[PDB]
């Protein structure tokens, strides 16, 4: 599933 | 008896008076994500990052803290299915334990535990973490992180948590915000797979449209009454 990460980039 | 699968977010443990990243601007206790949620946050200012998860693991074990009705009534839950449910949660609390659950997957690792920096053991930890604690599992003893998978690190027991996802006659998702992946992609897999999708929430996830069957309002209402419904059901 890839890593921790949050839908928003910036 | 039905193979379930709960997730659990942040939103469980809201009303017991954990909080976290809020909505509004992503903000977790006035601090940027970026500073104190990323392994860079904490090599550019590790005394900071240290004394911020000393902060939340000491709020964690104050009396006034508790699990509530939604915690309690998962221990329930796993107490009727036994070796057919699973707890998955994105959560670095103890709540779950604490209500009764056990083979809780924290995905994003515990707040009462530590890490070697070098050889990686997790070390069970209650108290402050200053520079002149060290690990217990090296012949030279290595500094101490907290063990909580930060943005841009990998989640824990991925493996495990597919396979139930895969495995799955319900999944339950609680509390999740649905902007944190690959936690916000589970429900997709477990849809594919066949399983029974629900959403226990005070708010609509970001993906809540994907689930089949959803309740909304306070976690210490919502769940303890979905859950009872679940083992009347089962008779
Ligand atoms: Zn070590």
Redesign the interface.
Known sequence: ????????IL | KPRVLVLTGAGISAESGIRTFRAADGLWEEHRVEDVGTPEGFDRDPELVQAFYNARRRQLQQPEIQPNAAHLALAKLQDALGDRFLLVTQNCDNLHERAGNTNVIHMHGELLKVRCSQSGQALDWTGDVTPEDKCHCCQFPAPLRPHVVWFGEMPLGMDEIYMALSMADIFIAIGTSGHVYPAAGFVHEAKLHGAHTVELNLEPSQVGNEFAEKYYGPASQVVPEFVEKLLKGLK
Request: charged share 50%; proline share 0%.
């Open positions: 599933g890839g890593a921790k990460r949050h839908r928003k």
